[PDB]
Amino acid sequence: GAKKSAIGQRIVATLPYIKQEVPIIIVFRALGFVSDRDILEHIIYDFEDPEMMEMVKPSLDEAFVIQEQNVALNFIGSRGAKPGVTKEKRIKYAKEVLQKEMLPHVGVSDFCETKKAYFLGYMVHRLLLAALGRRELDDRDHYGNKR
Amino acid sequence: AKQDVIEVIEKAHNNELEPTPGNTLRQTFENQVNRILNDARDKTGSSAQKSLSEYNNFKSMVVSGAKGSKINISQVIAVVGQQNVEGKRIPFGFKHRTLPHFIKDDYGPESRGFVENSYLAGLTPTEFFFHAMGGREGLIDTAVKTAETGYIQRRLIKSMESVMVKYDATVRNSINQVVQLRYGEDGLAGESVEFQNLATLKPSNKAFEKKFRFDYTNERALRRTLQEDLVKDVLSNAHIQNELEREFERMREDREVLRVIFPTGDSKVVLPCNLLRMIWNAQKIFHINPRLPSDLHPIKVVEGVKELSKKLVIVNGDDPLSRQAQENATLLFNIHLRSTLCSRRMAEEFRLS
Amino acid sequence: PGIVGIRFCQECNNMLYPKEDKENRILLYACRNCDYQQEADNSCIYVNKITHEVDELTQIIADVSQDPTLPRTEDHPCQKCGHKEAVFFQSHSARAEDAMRLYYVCTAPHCGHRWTE
Amino acid sequence: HTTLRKVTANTAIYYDPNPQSTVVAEDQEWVNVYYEMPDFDVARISPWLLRVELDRKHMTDRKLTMEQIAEKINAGFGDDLNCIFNDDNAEKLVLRIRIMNSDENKMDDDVFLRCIESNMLTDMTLQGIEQISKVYMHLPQTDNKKKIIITEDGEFKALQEWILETDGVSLMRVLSEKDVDPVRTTSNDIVEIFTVLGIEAVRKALERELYHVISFDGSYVNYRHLALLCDTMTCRGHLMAIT
Amino acid sequence: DDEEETYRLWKIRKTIMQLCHDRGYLVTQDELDQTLEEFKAQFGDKPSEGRPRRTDLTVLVAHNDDPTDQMFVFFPEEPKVGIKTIKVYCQRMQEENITRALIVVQQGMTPSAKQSLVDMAPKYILEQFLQQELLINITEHELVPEHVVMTKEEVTELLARYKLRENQLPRIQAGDPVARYFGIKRGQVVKIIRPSETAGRYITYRLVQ
Amino acid sequence: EVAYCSTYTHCEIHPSMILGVCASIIPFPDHNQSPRNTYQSAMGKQAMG
Amino acid sequence: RDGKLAKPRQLHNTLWGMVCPAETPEGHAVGLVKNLALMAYISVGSQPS
């Protein structure tokens, strides 16, 4: 297509208790990082490597239209299990999603929005290494992955 | 062998290994190491099969095909050889090494699963594990394939179940729709046929005219292979000589048809009756002496096959549509039956009375 | 040519975007959320290496010299300090095209020199 | 099938205010050579430059000419695109590209110029036939693939001749091309034999495939039973799956 | 280039002259075998800015039994054809009194034209051939057995010998590349003569439905 | 004298402890074709005793 | 058990010493059920306080 060809590869997260996919940079702004320098500071630990930089760039242009935290939570809450009648019912709903059902092993309570920021940026960081090919795809049967 | 694998491995570290066209450098390396190791286990196998005494019992069960194969003797005495998983040499389950014992990026024969011990001397610990990895692939296949081969066996039957050879001998499915005009296109049940050679196909043009021609010019060779009454009979009659040139014309016409039907000159065909055996059976029952001159008239060989070929009826009819459809059904059999019963072969090779 | 790289605005710290000055014909970078503009020094924008001949000596970490599971030879001495131990390994990289080339990492503390033969 | 990405070394988009600027060091030589007598620039020259590199290995491997690529790019996209190239003398083989001259006479440019690249690298189709991934060349040692001729002596003489074997199939165009043998060319895929050569060719090409999987093991199943299965399938007039 | 497009116009013309010969239309032995240079002499090399324009390549061949029947092979110059273009051709068939004719399309027919061909069954029949489907004669492939279209006299005598209804034969659909080749219409029966490795020859009959 | 590895960081107690309970009853299991230690694992659980 | 995919069934290098290579059921359950090696000790867990 005309758009698919120009953009390149876009990254998306599929969250628990959300009907369909959500773009990634929307998920970092939902966690309280407004600027793209802070968002890309959690995902890419060294800015002198442009190869990663070019990988993320098309995922900023898809999230370019929502620049604000409370706009972003509303972007998520629209897709929840049921759409909230009132807006602030959705923002209250999406924030309860990021607090509890989002990566609960990091933390469940309040200021964990920072603790969830690095590690969630680390999923997005390690998904790049397998896209660039600097690491091996994990093995489904490797018996160290089993409990 | 394990020293020739270290050179191929050392050549690839320094990049000196040049890829075979159509092959990744990983594909050309995984091939050259398999070309060496196969020759190893193919050599040590044949070096073990030379050593077996005439009294060996393995050699007794292998030579008569009763049980076991020549490759089971190799693995007992000599080497078990490379162990494969999914058609490839043992993979890397850990990061860049096969088992905790080996060093990362060891492509040598031992690290990647070549077992250099024979079941008799016993496998070393790791070779025991890799040998177990190559055997699991055998157990799994046998569990998986049976359920697929049984779901296909059921589909082939339900689709064909009602096709049957009707009394017209036309094969027709359950609706009366025609699958075939005659069964198998020759109209012959498959249990009574055998393999045979055509023998008119695939000699040279110069030798063909030597074997089937029946030269009557010699007057000497004929005294040799034929009784005194008959050679004086064959030389005199211009008509008899005319009929024998006609028969050889029909062998060339058939030799041109065979080369159309059988390109690549494969002469092995499946036909209803064995001619070389029955000509061979009628030598023994009647006590024919092939050193002696035969009494069999060379015409009554010709007039007897023509009168035979009319009595072999696949398709019954007087119509010009029925005649043409028999000449096709019996085509390749009458061609074969005029090769072996030829008037010359009866005079020379067989000497039938 | 260069593999280029990102630039960030100095106010809202967003991604600057390249754009063309039509009057002066000079490449500019402009954040889209403010009026901040900056002149392009590099003059290249989008660069893509398809043949992607890649230098692994940049990715290799000097800490690799502490792994027991890697082989080492005293055949190849260190190029810098002339140390005999060198712990060598292959690409260890997916999408490496075809490379069995060994990369060498010098042992002994803090040298970390990394060469290829 | 050779896409332009097969022969491409690297790609970069540059901003040139005027061509004689040549922000790159080397291009300035032959850039001026073409602009000593510049043609079809009458409208204006778009500033946005697309400069691609071509590996001489893959270029000489497929016997490709810079003039040939220049034609296909200019022909594929038309006059909306201008293309300029080196002589072989250049050790670094370069192909310059710019937006339409008369376009100066939405989509922006650098965006629209990157949209051209990602369309070219995949879609150019320099050579060959799309859907044909690879083609292997070898001399067959099996008497089935060996051309076998009746000599002047009537003997069978098996000849060795090079044959190609493709990964992926489009049968109708492969047959049509010159020097390719119309008669003996064949694919294993049935449906593309059905749609091209008819239902009779499927009746035969199916019993040639079934006879290959059954007799590959060395096993032997009579020809009568192969020919009935291929008769039941194709006697309805079209391919009848067993399903 | 124009050497390829001159070579393509050499196959298409040659392969069609084999259709007309195999359907029983009178075709001179010289027109069947043409060396490219002899073809390049008659129709002159490069089509583009050249004497062959893709028109005047038209072929008029008369049937062997009836000199009146004939047929045309039309080459449209357009990449795609449309009802306004065919209506030009059909107006020409009306002009010269024939019925049957062929059309060799470069790329494809507009979906509105395909039905327009069917729109006239009795008066005029027309057949769509893509420019590729004629680039090679499929009759000469090894997989395809010899096909022979059968007269009505022979189909009656056939179905009486085996005592078959018409619908108990195997079928070959009218959309089959070897049905188009021989210009076969629903209800005709074809005779497949193919060599076999058991019988040595075999004759299959396909109905066309 | 030819150093495969000088770094060994752990030694295994015995190599034959890689085998389970039902495959530990087989004498000389390394001398058998590999499916034959798997079948005994199946028939060692069915033995009357 | 139904699935014909052979990747979960095959014996994997990570099973050295912690799972018996030979012992395994047959039939549809091949390789999906696995005995434990002798020395192998599954860890009961703890708190990372």
Ligand SMILES: [Zn+2]
């Ligand atoms: Zn800004």
Ligand SMILES: [Zn+2]
């Ligand atoms: Zn050093």
